[PDB]
Design a protein around this ligand. Structure first.
Ligand SMILES: *[C@@H]1O[C@H](CO)[C@@H](O[C@@H]2O[C@H](CO)[C@@H](O[C@@H]3O[C@H](CO)[C@@H](O)[C@H](O)[C@@H]3O)[C@H](O)[C@H]2NC(C)=O)[C@H](O)[C@H]1NC(C)=O
Ligand SMILES: *[C@@H]1O[C@H](CO)[C@@H](O[C@@H]2O[C@H](CO)[C@@H](O)[C@H](O)[C@H]2NC(C)=O)[C@H](O)[C@H]1NC(C)=O
Ligand SMILES: Cc1cccc(NC(=O)c2ccc(C(F)(F)F)cc2C(=O)O)n1
Length: 653
């Protein structure tokens, strides 16, 4: 344990609040950053709606149900909370069966005063704030009109009809799909993709034969129907639709799907579903254009039914992602990549962990991670893997140790180096959060039955101390805490036993970490270190990062203003910083990219109908987000591969 005098500190700081009876649908929303404002919304269906508010981080709520006029709020649309600190809150309310249109309750300041506005239409969707201006909203109506508002929902105007899907781009741009006749389901693949810069003053048709579309990073993606067929394929656009490239990705049937797994201004992770009811697909990573794709992972478990994947950005160390794959035998293994998908491997098992029945060898086994897929199978998993960018290196997850994901009741495992190494944090399932950029870690035992106790650790999970926060135990469902993992306030939620009420105990760790952190506590940490002795040690994507990192031994507060300190070393370029361009491959182990003897499959499709500027390749492209400098420069004098597809074909004219 190692902490002296904790019960004293936490006694004062434990704050209980009580709420009304089960069972009602419960919504909790944080409003703003550095505000402490929380909205709890409760709705009841029997032959109404309650709304509370707290400015103290959840220590004391007081009941503002007065401010909505006592009317009935609909949990379908929930609470549409404005971006950043704009403080916008919008609630959609239920109206009499035959009404003009719907009604919403608008707060422009952190839910202190609400104004009720009657809409000219009926909302089919939660209203969506424009990213650049929180005063801009768009909604889809039940008649499929696209409605827009410049004034934050006071006045609306219908800027197009027959709209399937509509999204805010950057700079108040709206992208939406329309349909000619029939219904969005009927005309699917026949959809038309539009853009409007001026909020409906003027439009442009950027797409046709559209199955679907989506945004990630700088890319606009659209899947387009074959003129000849039911197959579709991805086209990509960097200009917001003005020009369109066919991706080098396989086409799919109507059985299959694309999923954008992750996107950043450098690249995307694209999941392509496998033909047949596989339950798996292939992961591709793109180049910085989104045009050129590299096969990253085989048999990536993503289910056709319910849409579960285990795919996880480990957001506490750059380059690092974990995911599940379906082996040849039907068993699920976890895989981790440290280099942004350039290579996948098995997570290393804890030093002292021993293998389970899954493992065919008893001293030699991996760690496997419970994530969305596990949870969906009703395995005993209260939480998915957790990591925060402020807390460098830290990953917390339920797992098992063996050759595959085990159905047994999992322990909880922690990593401080971003997933290179692991130890058992806690035996048994737990709920966990991170406070104060890793200054504190907090855990609740997951029990079939009531708990009066919360666990906390100030050394990043190496040591734990038990605190009893209530002497009347609760049935415990969840933790609420301020997003961004910067506060010292945690809210334990649950209900009492039997004739009941929901309760929340919010604990301030304010005095548990009494003294502030200062330079002395931090220590120099090279990320991604494999071999100390090496010049190139810790180069990922062409460079190293050295971090200043809070000493495990130091017990103190990083503070709300804490800034991860790190400095880059820029590594010399090797071939391993380059990906094969179109029509090139690595045949041997050797990194070197050589010309393919000929194009096959979707390589041949791309070559046949492909956009011509990309056809000449350098054989080599710098991995996106790779910052390496100097060293090797294999990128080549451009060479036209157009003729080498068509050299086989007889040509006309
Ligand atoms: C996996 O998760 C990591 C950690 O969150 C992602 O890295 C983050 O990427 C975002 C977007 O590229 C970076 O955003 C920042 O946005 C501000 C403007 O709001 C801009 O001024 C900054 O220059 C920066 O772009 C964010 O800094 C970055 N976080 C860290 C710690 O590097 C990563 O993108 C995720 N991977 C994928 C493929 O999405
Ligand atoms: C934990 O919650 C308390 C509220 O109970 C937060 O206190 C606020 O602190 C800021 C700056 O320290 C003040 O400007 C606010 O006026 C305080 N509000 C109240 C109601 O006291 C405290 O910041 C939270 N702790 C952390 C680490 O975020
Ligand atoms: C889990 C699941 C189930 C069913 C469908 C999907 N994905 C898509 O429909 C999709 C989304 C985005 C894009 C685009 F934006 F990349 F183009 C293309 C498609 C596509 O399949 O055609 N995902």
């Amino acid at each position: 344990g190692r902490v002296r005098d904790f019960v004293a500190k936490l006694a004062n700081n434990t704050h209980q609040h009580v709420f009304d009876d089960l069972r009602g649908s419960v919504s909790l929303s944080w409003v703003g950053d550095s505000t402490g404002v929380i909205l709890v919304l409760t709705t009841f269906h029997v032959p109404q709606s309650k709304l509370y508010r707290s400015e103290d981080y959840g220590k004391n709520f007081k009941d503002i149900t007065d401010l909505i006029n006592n009317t009935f709020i609909r949990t379908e649309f929930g609470m549409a909370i404005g971006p950043e600190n704009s403080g916008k809150v919008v609630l959609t309310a239920e109206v009499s069966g035959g009404s003009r249109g719907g009604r919403i309750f608008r707060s422009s300041d952190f839910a202190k005063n609400f104004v009720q506005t009657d809409l000219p239409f009926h909302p089919l969707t939660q209203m969506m704030y424009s990213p650049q201006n929180s005063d801009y909203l768009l909604a889809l109506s039940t008649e499929n009109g696209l409605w827009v508002s410049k004034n934050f929902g006071g006045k609306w105007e219908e800027i197009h009809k027959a709209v399937c899907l509509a999204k805010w781009g950057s700079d108040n741009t709206i992208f939406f799909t329309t349909y000619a006749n029939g219904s969005c389901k009927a005309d699917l693949g026949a959809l038309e993709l539009w853009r409007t810069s001026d909020l409906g003053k003027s439009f442009k048709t950027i797409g046709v034969k559209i199955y679907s579309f989506g945004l990630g990073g700088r890319f606009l993606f659209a899947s387009v129907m074959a003129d000849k067929d039911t197959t579709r394929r991805i086209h990509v656009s960097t200009d917001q639709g003005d020009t369109w490239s066919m991706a080098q990705l396989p086409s799919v049937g109507q059985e299959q799907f694309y999923s954008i797994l992750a996107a950043n201004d450098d690249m995307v992770f694209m999941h392509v579903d496998e033909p047949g009811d596989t339950g798996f697909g292939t992961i591709f990573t793109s180049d910085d254009r989104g045009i050129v794709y590299s096969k990253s992972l085989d048999r990536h478990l993503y289910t056709t039914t319910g849409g579960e994947t285990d795919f996880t950005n480990v957001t506490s160390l750059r380059g690092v992602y974990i995911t599940s794959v379906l082996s040849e035998d039907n068993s699920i293994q976890t895989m981790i990549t440290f280099d942004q998908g350039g290579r996948w491997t098995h997570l290393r098992k804890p030093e002292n962990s021993e293998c389970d029945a899954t493992a065919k060898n008893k001293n030699e086994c991996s760690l496997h991670i419970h994530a969305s897929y596990s949870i969906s199978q009703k395995l005993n998993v209260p939480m998915a893997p957790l990591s925060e960018p402020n807390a460098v290196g830290i990953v917390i997850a339920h797992g098992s140790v063996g050759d595959a994901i085990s159905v047994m009741v999992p322990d909880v495992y922690i990593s401080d180096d971003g997933g290179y190494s692991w130890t058992k944090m806690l035996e048994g399932p737990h709920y966990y959060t991170i406070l104060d950029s890793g200054g504190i870690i907090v855990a609740i035992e997951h029990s079939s039955r009531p708990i009066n106790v919360i666990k906390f650790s100030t050394d990043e999970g190496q040591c734990w101390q038990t605190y009893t926060f209530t002497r009347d135990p609760i049935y415990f469902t969840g933790l609420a805490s301020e997003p961004g993992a910067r506060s010292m306030n945690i809210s334990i939620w649950g209900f009492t036993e039997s004739t009941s009420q929901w309760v929340s105990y919010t604990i301030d760790f304010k005095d548990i970490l009494e003294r502030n952190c200062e330079e002395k506590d931090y220590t120099i940490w090279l990320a991604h270190s494999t071999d100390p002795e090496d010049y190139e040690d810790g180069c990922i994507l062409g460079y190293k990062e050295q971090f200043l990192r809070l000493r495990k031994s130091s017990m103190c507060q990083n503070g709300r203003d804490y800034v991860v300190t790190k400095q880059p070393s820029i590594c010399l370029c090797s071939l391993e910083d380059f990906l094969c361009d179109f029509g090139y491959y690595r045949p041997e182990n050797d990194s070197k990219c050589v010309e393919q003897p000929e194009l096959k499959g979707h390589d041949l499709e791309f070559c046949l109908y492909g956009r011509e500027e990309h056809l000449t390749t350098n054989g080599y492209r710098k991995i996106p987000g790779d910052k390496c400098q100097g060293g090797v420069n294999p990128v080549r004098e451009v060479k036209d591969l157009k003729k080498k597809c068509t050299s086989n074909f007889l040509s006309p004219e």
